[PDB]
Amino acid sequence: EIKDIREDTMHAEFNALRAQVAINDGNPDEAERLAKLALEELPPGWFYSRIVATSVLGEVLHCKGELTRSLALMQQTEQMARQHDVWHYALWSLIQQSEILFAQGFLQTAWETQEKAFQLINEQHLEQLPMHEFLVRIRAQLLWAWARLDEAEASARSGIEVLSSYQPQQQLQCLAMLIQCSLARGDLDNARSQLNRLENLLGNGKYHSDWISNANKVRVIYWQMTGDKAAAANWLRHTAKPEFANNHFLQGQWRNIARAQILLGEFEPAEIVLEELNENARSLRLMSDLNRNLLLLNQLYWQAGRKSDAQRVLLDALKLANRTGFISHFVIEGEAMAQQLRQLIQLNTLPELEQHRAQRILREIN
Amino acid sequence: EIKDIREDTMHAEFNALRAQVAINDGNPDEAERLAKLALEELPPGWFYSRIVATSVLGEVLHCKGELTRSLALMQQTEQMARQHDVWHYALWSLIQQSEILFAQGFLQTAWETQEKAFQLINEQHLEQLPMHEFLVRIRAQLLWAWARLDEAEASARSGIEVLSSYQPQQQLQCLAMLIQCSLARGDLDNARSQLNRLENLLGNGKYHSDWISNANKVRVIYWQMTGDKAAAANWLRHTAKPEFANNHFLQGQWRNIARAQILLGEFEPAEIVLEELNENARSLRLMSDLNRNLLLLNQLYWQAGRKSDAQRVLLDALKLANRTGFISHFVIEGEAMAQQLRQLIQLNTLPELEQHRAQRILREIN
DSSP, rough: OOOOOHHHHHHHHHHHHHHHHHHHHTTTHHHHHHHHHHHHOOOTHHHHHHHHHHHHHHHHHHHHTTTTHHHHHHHHHHHHHTTTTTTHHHHHHHHHHHHHHTTTTTTTHHHHHHHHHEEEEEOOOOOSTHHHHHHHHHHHHHHHHOOOOOHHHHHHHHHHHHHHSOOOGHHHHHHHHHHHHHHHHOHHHHHHHHHHHHHHHTTSOOHHHHHHHHHHHHHHHHHHHHOOOHHHHHHHHHHHHOOOTTGGGEEEEEEHHHHHHHTTTTTTHHHHHHHHHHHHHHHHHHHHHHHHHHHHHHHHHHHHHHHHHHHHHHHHHHHHHHHHHHHHHHHHHHHHHHHHHHHHHHOOOOOOHHHHHHHHHHHOOO | OOHHHHHHHHHHHHHHHHHHHHHHHTTTTHHHHHHHHHHHHHOOOOOHHHHHHHHHHHHHHHHHHHHHHHHHHHHHHHHHHHHHHHHHHHHHHHHHHHHHHHHTOHHHHHHHHHHHHHHHEEEEOOOTHHHHHHHHHHHHHHHHHTHHHHHHHHHHHHHHHHHTSSGGGGGGHHHHHHHHHHHHHOOHHHHHHHHHHHHHHHHTTTHHHHHHHHHHHHHHHHHTTTTTTHHHHHHHHHHHOOTTTTGGGHHHHHHHHHHHHEEEEHHHHHHHHHHHHHHHHHHOOOOHHHHHHHHHHHHHHHTTTTTHHHHHHHHHHHHHHHHHHOOOHHHHTTHHHHHHHHHHHHHOOSSSSHHHHHHHHHHHHH
């Protein structure tokens, strides 16, 4: 166990990269163990592995839901990366920072953070690089929330162009975003055509669970919009159902499950799912998740004929949107949402902000 | 060299399948050698390998341009396959028969042959099977020639659906057909969007030369329609230029080369190419190739300002279309074609049939 100190330090660098692969493979505990072991043995000078290990710990804390500490580590990573011209880690850091901000419902701050990433890309000529697609994809997500659909679509298409030299499977998420735009527009013909491509890609690759849940998100919304109970039921029977267990990274997949359950009239289990997701969202101040969940609860109560409950949560959702800025999440609920909003607007009792958003949404829908 | 006769016959069956793989790999001489060796040693009873070897010889003769004899072998193959319920070889035979008929300019007969294939598919419940895509693709090609674009597009989309479970690369040819439809409609926005997908597929697979030439066919037409000399020149510099050498299977790629040359003002070499292709087309009575080549010659003369030559070959092309039934091949030539046809129609000297087709084409273009 005696070697040149050089070899010991090189082994520590290997540990940092082993940690990076571990978190990528969905093994945060091993990633944390390895990243810590690396940092304990990396002296000044061996800057690259230190950037990687610090970045990995940021990802680990993000996974754990320790968002404030995660952001601090992402910031540390960004600064070190900039200091050493390690542009890919500086850009990856900014992308992750936006992700947390968006989840917290701070969309303007997320936009500004994405803007810093675009600035970095422009300054260092990083346009043709793959990570550029991730940035335009999250920019599209934000534009979509704000109902700037033409811009969101253009952002998603720029992502597809960035990855034009890679296998078609790499476009899965930007394609899902294109479909998400078609769904918000009520352009079901285009959504269906795009979904044909999405489903073909899904059947031709082994993807990360989060990619699959994102793709399934738009498939389930399309099935809801077309009353495709058969497709939703078959999907639900075979989809992954990892125990939620207060894991915020599983909010998306469980919303897909709840949406399918609601479409199928399985109101009881869906309400239990959504209440559990909301406990988690409130505990971590994930206002975006909360806003999405309240809209699904509204759909559940509405379809179940529970008028009072439906109205109560719709008012909560509209109020919460004063902070999240969400518009399109309401729009995809179509006629059911339009009827409810027309009713609220006609009563003349909504506060000015909510009244204005209700009117905007009703316009997007009509 | 003494073995159970059973082993000798099994080796003969292997030779038949080795011949099938050889022709698929573009080695007709070896395929012919092996298929003949197999048939010489296959007794009655060993029907499957005999169907394969006979089918292979049909493909070999097709390659050699001995179309009449090739059709006879395809017919023999179809009958034997039907006799033994070997549906895939009966369907493959009918597809090949149509291919020859279409090349000969007998489009109605090709349609009828395709119809027999659809009948077989319906009777034997072969709808979900992969070969169904090849049939709907050649049906789309025929519908496209006749300018039944909505039908052609639907046929191509049914092909894409048939292959939905396979890798996206398998849809290359039906996607090229969708683009071909968009080009005939003058719907360049959709053509460009579809071409983005086509080019991504082209950069992500090792394909047969004929698949590549078919995909490039629509890319070059799009570049011509958008005046993209840069793209055409780069493509031309790097594309395959196998010596034509009186090989009718190379008509398509050389037309792509000539079309690019014409767009780039390289009239002299393009005229030499087209004249050589026409010698081959006339020698084998390939009226469809002749009709396509005459239209490219028309474009060449027109762009070169050789009015008399342009008119002469356009009149020849219109006359030939009385037999081929081609419409869309004229339509994709757009404004240049429209101007020329308006001039011909206004002179009031065209025979009734050609006048009627000229008017139809001018309508498709406007």
